[PDB]
Amino acid sequence: SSLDNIEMAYARQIYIYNEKIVNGHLQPNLVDLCASVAELDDKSISDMWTMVKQMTDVLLTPATDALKNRSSVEVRMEFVRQALAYLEQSYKNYTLVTVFGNLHQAQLGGVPGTYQLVRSFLNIKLPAPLPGLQDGEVEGHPVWALIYYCMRCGDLLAASQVVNRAQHQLGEFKTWFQEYMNSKDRRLSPATENKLRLHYRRALRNNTDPYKRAVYCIIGRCDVTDNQSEVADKTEDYLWLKLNQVCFDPQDRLTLSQFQKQLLEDYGESHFTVNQQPFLYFQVLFLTAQFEAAVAFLFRMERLRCHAVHVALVLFELKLLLKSSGQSAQLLSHEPGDPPCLRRLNFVRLLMLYTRKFESTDPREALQYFYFLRDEKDSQGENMFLRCVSELVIESREFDMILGKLENDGSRKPGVIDKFTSDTKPIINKVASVAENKGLFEEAAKLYDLAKNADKVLELMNKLLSPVVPQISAPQSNKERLKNMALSIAERYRAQGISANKFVDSTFYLLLDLITFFDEYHSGHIDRAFDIIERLKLVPLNQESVEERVAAFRNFSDEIRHNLSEVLLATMNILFTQFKRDRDSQLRSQARTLITFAGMIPYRTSGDTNARLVQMEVLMN
Amino acid sequence: EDRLKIDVIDWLVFDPAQRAEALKQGNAIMRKFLASKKHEAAKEVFVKIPQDSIAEIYLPAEDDNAIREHLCIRAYLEAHETFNEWFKHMNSVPQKPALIPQPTFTEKVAHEHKEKKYEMDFGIWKGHLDALTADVKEKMYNVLLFVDGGWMVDVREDAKEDHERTHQMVLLRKLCLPMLCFLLHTILHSTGQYQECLQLADMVSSERHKLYLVFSKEELRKLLQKLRESSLMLLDQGLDPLGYEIQ
């Protein structure tokens, strides 16, 4: 097996999600089905899916195009809020593990109020007082530190409580903050927003209290260039600092498009992967709505291929992933007729790479991933899922497992693909078609016979029999192994009343009779073998039938005319033997008949055959 | 391995400066196939040899013989191309009209016509036959009586030793000259030319060709039981064994 522990667990989860859609059940939450395995690994992966769920848990317009949802200002706004809510909660967990040694340890004693937690967080991260703080303290801590880390944790209420106990010190900041907490989308009114920004810009552009600076332009979304590096030293603190500063419809203003493009264009992977920590960059792209970038990026880490494919599937089963129309493009690209700030993922190629790894010895699991390509076609029109099953069968040669083995008793035990579509007639011909083009007739027959395509089964069975008609049928020979399959196809084609056009069909049952004629001839059962050839009315034995038999030879399958030479000789040698054992006249007359027939028929080795036939007739007299 | 050999010919034919080596090797290759009677094999090679090879090449003992051998081989092939046509025809004789005993007066007339049309076709199927018999015969005498030293027999005697080829040329004579004789006998007998059948015993025994040395003792007797058969039909006609009027 080519699948690692983690990859295998995901496969099982994707089998469920397929079993549900294959039986018409409720469309379960894919993101939940993937996070179910994440908990079996380190929290590096669990915290990823947590971000994936929260970033995709946005009210969408079902049955709407992918590009439309992702271009709409409506959806683009909720992404920023879902990310901020993740950066705030994520930071809140950092504040817990900073005070208590373990999340469990914090829980048993009880998670304290965000206010008392933050206070018990300031104790550690600033034990001694910084001399540059302003506006005094509140219950033993600087008022601005409390406000910042409370807003950072996302509890505006806890921050407003701090403000209520410092009404005299904070001046007019109270009426401004109380408006920020009330107004939605973390934005103030243009009039009041103007009043505070100008005040900050007036004489507080450079204040000795960094926490004061941070809060002001987090509330006013100002000084976008100043990264407030004094307080936002971590990467998440930067993302959170900026997403609280982005704006929507000219100076000192930043928008999501600029920010998202500004980040990866100027400070690409190189900047965010110098510490050899891959998820850091992924979180930067995913929490900025650049899902295709983050997916391709994370898909290149050979250790995190599994995770990047699935986060792509989630975005794909939620009409959020922007697929690349052309299949000839690179993995990541920007369509020419699209804005430059969005990118597109060649989803078809993405799955095709992941599959090649475990498609060789783990076919069942491969199909589960090929199903997601059911909705796509190629330039030639083939259904992508169907084509992927053809290529996977041509390579793996797993016919019984994937296509269903058709035993020699008339049964068709369904295969693994039967689960996904009930119309399995084309691919069985596709797979049968190539194997036919590769001279693998004995297989192409079994495959065509699996799809009950007798036109092709009998055609190929005619080719495999004609060479072996006069041969000696011996144990385990190529004659027995082909005759016995032909008879197993004759019964199942009569018991089920199946037949190809009379040309293909007539020749097929005719060869089977001839194969019996030589099997009796090679055994010495001369009398019995003579009777068979007489029924077939293939070789004339009375002079009257020569005219009609000669005309019939003209339109009989060349697979029959080929073996005419051996038939005449065996029949002659049959009469020849019976002569040495009135009757003499009758054999003599029949001997003549064979000669005149052979004389009027142009066929294989007519030279040596016509001569031998005449000699055997002379010895009779 | 058939293709390996028939394919090495196009490589030697491509370069006109090696036409003498292309022919020589073409001969060898066709000598192996002839011993197996692979005539479509031998001929598929025979066409690859440009039809104007002989003209251009113009002489070492190895080139005089290979030119002769090539034509010998063509004389042999053409003696099988025309026989298989002739033989194919011998086996396509117009069939007698079918009889409908107790006929209606309708079936009586359809049959008076089918019987009169057949008595036109059988005349032409002797017509086409005679012309395919006159032609296949000529070819069989071009091989059997090959001009200037017999078939597959070098005229040039100053080449360097090639036991493989030389013994391949003796063999080809012992496989194919008994076999061409027996065919010609079958052609002469099939067309009722019995007097001439018996005159195969002059051709063979002849000291001019010494064809009888290419025969095994068994093959001889067989040819002698073939001629005694033509003789019979000559008695049935009222003539002596050899076809001459009984005075």
Side-chain angles (χ1 to χ4, degrees), chain A, chain B residues 3-43 45-55 57-94 96-113 115-156 158-159 162-246:
Chain A
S1 194
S2 295
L3 299 173
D4 302 8
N5 311 294
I6 300 305
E7 310 182 326
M8 189 61 182
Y10 276 136
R12 267 184 293 262
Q13 300 306 310
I14 289 285
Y15 179 46
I16 301 174
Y17 182 102
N18 278 330
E19 180 173 12
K20 298 301 177 186
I21 295 181
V22 164
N23 291 12
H25 296 204
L26 178 63
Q27 184 176 358
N29 223 14
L30 183 59
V31 59
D32 289 321
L33 271 174
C34 296
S36 63
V37 168
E39 62 182 9
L40 295 176
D41 209 334
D42 290 3
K43 66 178 179 181
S44 310
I45 295 92
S46 300
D47 302 331
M48 184 198 66
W49 284 113
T50 288
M51 157 177 57
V52 175
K53 188 182 301 186
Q54 189 173 138
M55 284 298 304
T56 55
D57 183 4
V58 303
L59 181 59
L60 283 162
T61 312
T64 308
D65 182 76
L67 172 58
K68 196 173 186 178
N69 302 332
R70 291 278 298 286
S71 301
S72 66
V73 59
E74 289 84 359
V75 182
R76 297 170 60 93
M77 282 173 59
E78 188 170 352
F79 281 140
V80 177
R81 291 192 303 268
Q82 293 294 355
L84 281 166
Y86 172 83
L87 300 174
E88 289 166 340
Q89 183 59 30
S90 177
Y91 196 90
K92 192 171 197 285
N93 296 327
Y94 171 74
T95 309
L96 284 162
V97 300
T98 287
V99 171
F100 312 85
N102 209 342
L103 294 157
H104 183 294
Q105 164 70 333
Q107 164 166 349
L108 62 80
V111 165
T114 298
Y115 172 70
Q116 295 85 359
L117 180 72
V118 159
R119 181 182 65 198
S120 295
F121 171 85
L122 288 186
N123 60 354
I124 293 185
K125 178 159 184 176
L126 62 87
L130 192 69
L133 304 168
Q134 286 284 8
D135 294 5
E137 303 176 347
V138 161
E139 295 184 349
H141 288 93
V143 57
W144 289 115
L146 298 171
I147 294 169
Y148 172 81
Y149 290 104
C150 284
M151 295 170 59
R152 184 67 182 82
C153 292
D155 199 334
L156 286 166
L157 297 176
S160 50
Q161 289 187 246
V162 189
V163 187
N164 278 53
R165 286 196 66 75
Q167 299 169 327
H168 181 14
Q169 287 292 11
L170 295 174
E172 198 175 19
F173 187 86
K174 186 182 186 303
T175 195
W176 293 338
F177 189 98
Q178 292 292 106
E179 184 178 358
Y180 181 89
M181 184 182 64
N182 295 332
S183 62
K184 59 182 69 177
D185 291 334
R186 281 106 159 179
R187 180 171 276 94
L188 291 169
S189 182
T192 54
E193 177 175 356
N194 167 74
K195 294 168 62 183
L196 68 86
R197 183 177 298 191
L198 300 169
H199 181 61
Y200 169 75
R201 191 73 54 198
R202 185 169 177 85
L204 289 74
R205 64 179 299 271
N206 193 340
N207 190 323
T208 53
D209 194 330
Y211 294 108
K212 190 171 193 174
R213 283 156 35 94
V215 174
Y216 264 102
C217 276
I218 290 174
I219 297 295
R221 308 214 171 208
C222 45
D223 207 356
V224 298
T225 58
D226 189 2
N227 301 321
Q228 311 288 359
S229 57
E230 294 159 313
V231 294
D233 55 352
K234 303 148 174 79
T235 305
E236 295 198 4
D237 287 358
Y238 173 73
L239 296 169
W240 178 88
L241 169 58
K242 282 279 167 282
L243 296 179
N244 275 117
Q245 291 176 322
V246 299
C247 178
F248 297 99
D249 182 9
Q251 309 289 26
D252 187 10
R253 281 291 186 176
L254 179 64
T255 187
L256 178 61
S257 297
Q258 290 172 352
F259 181 77
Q260 69 191 11
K261 187 173 181 63
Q262 170 178 329
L263 263 63
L264 69 76
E265 289 291 0
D266 304 359
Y267 304 147
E269 301 141 53
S270 58
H271 188 186
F272 293 111
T273 191
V274 292
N275 58 11
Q276 59 177 9
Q277 182 64 356
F279 291 100
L280 177 61
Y281 186 64
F282 178 85
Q283 288 196 353
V284 169
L285 285 169
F286 214 89
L287 300 189
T288 49
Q290 311 191 70
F291 303 143
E292 294 73 23
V295 166
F297 165 84
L298 186 67
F299 175 59
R300 303 201 312 267
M301 319 327 182
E302 299 180 358
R303 316 196 185 283
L304 314 177
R305 289 181 212 161
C306 53
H307 305 310
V309 163
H310 295 341
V311 171
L313 297 181
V314 175
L315 297 162
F316 171 67
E317 290 294 302
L318 298 193
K319 299 289 177 295
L320 276 163
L321 190 75
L322 312 188
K323 328 153 292 174
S324 85
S325 57
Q327 305 188 13
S328 49
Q330 278 198 324
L331 189 73
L332 188 80
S333 51
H334 76 290
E335 291 282 11
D338 288 1
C341 69
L342 63 77
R343 302 291 183 97
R344 292 243 188 178
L345 181 55
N346 178 346
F347 179 90
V348 195
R349 186 156 184 272
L350 176 52
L351 265 63
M352 284 292 294
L353 309 175
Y354 186 53
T355 58
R356 279 171 187 157
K357 186 181 182 191
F358 57 90
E359 86 176 9
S360 64
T361 186
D362 302 306
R364 301 187 194 249
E365 296 84 353
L367 296 169
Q368 310 302 317
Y369 291 106
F370 289 136
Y371 195 58
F372 296 83
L373 299 168
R374 67 193 177 276
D375 299 311
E376 307 299 334
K377 292 182 178 64
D378 56 356
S379 57
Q380 295 300 339
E382 279 285 1
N383 178 262
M384 275 304 305
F385 173 80
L386 301 181
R387 221 188 85 184
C388 289
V389 176
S390 306
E391 302 176 4
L392 175 57
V393 171
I394 299 166
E395 293 289 351
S396 65
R397 313 292 286 185
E398 305 285 345
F399 303 117
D400 301 10
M401 298 299 192
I402 296 184
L403 298 176
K405 189 185 185 68
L406 181 141
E407 297 289 4
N408 284 273
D409 74 334
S411 63
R412 178 185 176 277
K413 291 184 175 178
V416 178
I417 182 161
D418 196 70
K419 284 183 168 60
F420 298 92
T421 60
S422 68
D423 194 26
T424 56
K425 60 185 176 60
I427 64 178
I428 294 295
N429 290 34
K430 186 71 172 296
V431 162
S433 175
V434 307
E436 180 191 21
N437 288 15
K438 317 305 140 189
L440 296 167
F441 291 81
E442 197 168 5
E443 262 191 2
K446 294 176 184 290
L447 289 166
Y448 273 136
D449 193 0
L450 185 156
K452 296 289 164 61
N453 184 342
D455 284 326
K456 300 293 292 183
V457 166
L458 297 180
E459 173 182 353
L460 308 192
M461 288 300 304
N462 291 7
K463 292 177 179 174
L464 308 192
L465 290 169
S466 179
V468 182
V469 172
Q471 194 166 350
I472 298 92
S473 188
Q476 303 226 309
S477 65
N478 288 327
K479 180 154 183 176
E480 175 182 325
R481 199 201 66 260
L482 281 172
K483 179 183 71 177
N484 284 9
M485 82 172 277
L487 302 185
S488 178
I489 282 179
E491 186 277 356
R492 295 191 294 92
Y493 273 33
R494 277 161 175 167
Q496 300 192 12
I498 312 179
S499 175
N501 56 93
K502 200 49 49 183
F503 179 81
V504 179
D505 198 82
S506 60
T507 303
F508 169 71
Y509 293 97
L510 177 55
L511 298 162
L512 288 173
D513 293 330
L514 292 169
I515 293 172
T516 309
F517 173 58
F518 289 105
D519 284 352
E520 294 281 24
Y521 168 68
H522 295 337
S523 305
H525 287 128
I526 307 301
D527 290 345
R528 295 183 181 276
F530 178 73
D531 292 354
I532 300 176
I533 182 59
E534 201 174 17
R535 299 176 229 163
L536 277 70
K537 287 179 286 184
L538 186 58
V539 292
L541 306 183
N542 45 29
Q543 288 293 330
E544 293 78 2
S545 300
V546 176
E547 280 200 354
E548 58 174 352
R549 302 286 192 276
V550 169
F553 173 90
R554 301 300 303 173
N555 55 29
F556 275 4
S557 177
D558 53 5
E559 288 80 17
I560 301 293
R561 306 187 295 186
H562 172 284
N563 288 313
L564 175 53
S565 170
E566 296 294 344
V567 171
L568 291 168
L569 296 173
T571 308
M572 182 68 75
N573 190 10
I574 279 171
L575 303 186
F576 180 78
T577 307
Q578 288 182 349
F579 197 108
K580 307 181 181 183
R581 302 176 179 176
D582 290 346
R583 186 69 190 171
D584 51 2
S585 295
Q586 188 182 26
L587 297 174
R588 193 180 289 177
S589 298
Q590 293 179 327
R592 305 262 210 282
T593 314
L594 279 178
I595 297 179
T596 60
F597 175 72
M600 304 176 181
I601 299 286
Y603 64 99
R604 282 287 312 289
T605 73
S606 54
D608 183 73
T609 303
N610 289 340
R612 291 183 59 84
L613 290 166
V614 177
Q615 288 186 341
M616 275 176 289
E617 177 282 341
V618 171
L619 275 50
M620 289 182 178
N621 311 318
Chain B
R3 281 303 170 197
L4 159 64
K5 295 277 80 182
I6 186 179
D7 278 345
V8 74
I9 260 305
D10 292 345
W11 161 271
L12 293 170
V13 153
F14 184 93
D15 178 20
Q18 297 296 124
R19 185 59 92 277
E21 185 66 38
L23 200 77
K24 274 184 294 186
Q25 299 200 17
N27 288 339
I29 295 167
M30 285 171 74
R31 280 193 314 254
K32 266 106 277 180
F33 301 150
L34 281 183
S36 294
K37 290 181 181 174
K38 300 158 184 167
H39 299 101
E40 283 300 325
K43 198 188 176 193
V45 173
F46 181 90
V47 290
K48 295 181 170 296
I49 304 278
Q51 195 79 343
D52 62 3
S53 288
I54 296 194
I57 285 186
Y58 286 104
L59 278 172
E62 289 70 26
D63 290 356
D64 185 358
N65 290 328
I67 283 185
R68 170 182 190 71
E69 173 183 358
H70 188 77
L71 300 179
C72 297
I73 293 180
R74 180 174 84 195
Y76 181 67
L77 294 188
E78 286 190 10
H80 264 280
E81 297 172 14
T82 64
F83 175 99
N84 300 335
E85 194 178 9
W86 176 93
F87 176 74
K88 173 188 175 180
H89 186 88
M90 268 285 307
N91 300 308
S92 77
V93 50
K96 206 68 179 185
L99 272 162
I100 317 176
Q102 301 312 332
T104 195
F105 292 104
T106 314
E107 291 170 314
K108 284 187 190 293
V109 145
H111 176 102
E112 288 178 359
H113 281 274
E115 182 185 48
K116 278 191 185 180
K117 195 222 168 178
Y118 161 81
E119 285 179 7
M120 183 195 59
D121 303 344
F122 181 93
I124 294 187
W125 165 92
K126 174 201 171 183
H128 284 120
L129 188 52
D130 293 2
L132 275 175
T133 266
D135 194 24
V136 72
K137 265 180 43 195
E138 165 196 336
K139 310 293 173 159
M140 307 281 273
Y141 284 135
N142 275 355
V143 180
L144 291 173
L145 303 183
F146 204 81
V147 309
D148 281 307
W151 184 67
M152 279 296 278
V153 178
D154 291 335
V155 169
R156 206 75 179 284
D158 62 297
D162 188 350
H163 311 282
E164 287 72 27
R165 175 180 180 276
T166 293
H167 282 92
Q168 277 172 345
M169 303 190 66
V170 166
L171 177 80
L172 279 192
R173 282 181 50 93
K174 290 167 35 205
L175 288 175
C176 320
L177 300 173
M179 181 201 53
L180 291 195
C181 196
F182 287 139
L183 285 190
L184 182 53
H185 174 89
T186 287
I187 299 171
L188 288 178
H189 199 91
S190 284
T191 58
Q193 317 187 39
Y194 306 136
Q195 182 179 230
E196 187 162 344
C197 275
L198 283 156
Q199 289 167 326
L200 297 176
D202 297 342
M203 177 193 64
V204 163
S205 72
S206 182
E207 279 304 328
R208 173 175 173 35
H209 308 94
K210 302 174 176 74
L211 290 162
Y212 57 91
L213 287 163
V214 154
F215 282 68
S216 73
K217 267 193 181 173
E218 191 174 12
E219 295 175 323
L220 289 191
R221 308 192 201 106
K222 186 49 58 182
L223 180 59
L224 277 175
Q225 298 167 22
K226 277 196 161 285
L227 295 189
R228 162 191 181 271
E229 286 309 324
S230 294
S231 290
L232 293 189
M233 267 37 80
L234 279 172
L235 293 176
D236 280 345
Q237 299 180 154
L239 324 166
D240 60 11
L242 288 46
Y244 301 77
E245 285 285 344
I246 324 182

